Design a protein around this ligand. Structure first.
Ligand code: HEM
Length: 291
């Protein structure tokens, strides 16, 4: 099963920087969402969920086909809450109807990371919408109540190794769990709409207690009001993951560079780029443009 990137007809870097900027300006404007967290975190989770359905064995799933727009995937229990991200991006799609759905959802996550002061994430265009019957079945996104061996095995299906898994999980410094969406409640730190390495610092430095929440699920909670999923906490229970947690807690730049590479890879899994494809784009932030 081969998915070849096909650039939206006649488009180039400037076109996609315009779409970036529209997303970024709306991120700035719609600041009230989720008790003033803003839409940045949910856009990052949307880009990950539309990509995290990929299966390396048969190239099903993945960001290419934009299939989150179809009911079966939109209504996956694992995707509860991401409707808010889709609705955010709808007026953007209306203004730029030429962009593919996969390109929009993945660009929304790149834009959110960068606007939240995260690393630059190179991004490539050319995902092509595919029909409803190419939508992957529910059940391909991971469970949160599991341990390190589950996490490790899960991510082999996405061709991610230990370092890439630990780097990607640093996105859990962003946003929060919502009890009605996932049966978990609370944020993982204090700066949860700024992209930093706080997730690793908090795993190492907080005093975590294993508690039950109001949905009767266990999670790790700290007296500062932070929380970790069981799969988050597994990163300090496993000695291989713990080493990498310590590395990223002690080196902000290294985390940013490893995250950028793993996140681009996540967003590009499944896609074949022609040798003649444009090189990846690195968008300027609004701040860098004086906008
Ligand atoms: C073992 C792997 C993972 C599990 C089990 C997991 C699970 C969760 C759960 C249960 C939530 C809460 C959803 C809610 O209640 O609204 C969450 C939120 C989130 N996840 Fe993950 N996740 C994983 C990996 C990742 C990855 C790889 C990324 C991106 C790189 C990511 C980004 C996020 C973001 C940014 C949020 C906050 C969303 C919000 O505030 O609306 N997750 N995740």
């Amino acid at each position: 099963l081969v998915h070849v990137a096909s650039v939206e007809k006649g488009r180039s870097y400037e076109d996609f920087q315009k779409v970036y900027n529209a997303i970024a300006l709306k991120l700035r404007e719609d600041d009230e969402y989720d008790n003033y967290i803003g839409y940045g975190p949910v856009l990052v989770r949307l880009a990950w969920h539309i990509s995290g359905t990929w299966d390396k064995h048969d190239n099903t799933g993945g960001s290419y086909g934009g299939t989150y727009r179809f009911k079966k995937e939109f209504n996956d229990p694992s995707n509860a809450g991401l409707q808010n991200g889709f609705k955010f991006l709808e007026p953007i799609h209306k203004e730029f109807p030429w962009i593919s759905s996969g390109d929009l959802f993945s660009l929304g996550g790149v834009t959110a990371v960068q606007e939240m002061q995260g690393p630059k994430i190179p991004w490539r265009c050319g995902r092509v919408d595919t029909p409803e019957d190419t939508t992957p079945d529910n059940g391909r996104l991971p469970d949160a109540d599991k341990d390190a061996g589950y996490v490790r095995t899960f991510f082999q299906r996405l061709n991610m190794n230990d370092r890439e898994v630990v780097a990607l999980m640093g996105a859990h410094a962003l946003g929060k769990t919502h009890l009605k969406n996932s049966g978990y409640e609370g944020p993982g730190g204090a700066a949860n709409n700024v992209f930093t390495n706080e997730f690793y610092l908090n795993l190492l430095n907080e005093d975590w207690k294993l508690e039950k929440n109001d949905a009767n699920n266990e999670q790790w909670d700290s007296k500062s009001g932070y929380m970790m999923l069981p799969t988050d906490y597994s990163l300090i229970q496993d000695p291989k993951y713990l080493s990498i947690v310590k590395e990223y807690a002690n080196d902000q730049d290294k985390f940013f560079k490893d995250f950028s590479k793993a996140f681009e890879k996540l967003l590009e899994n499944g896609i074949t780029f022609p040798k003649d494809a444009p090189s990846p784009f690195i968008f300027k932030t609004l701040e860098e443009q004086g906008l």
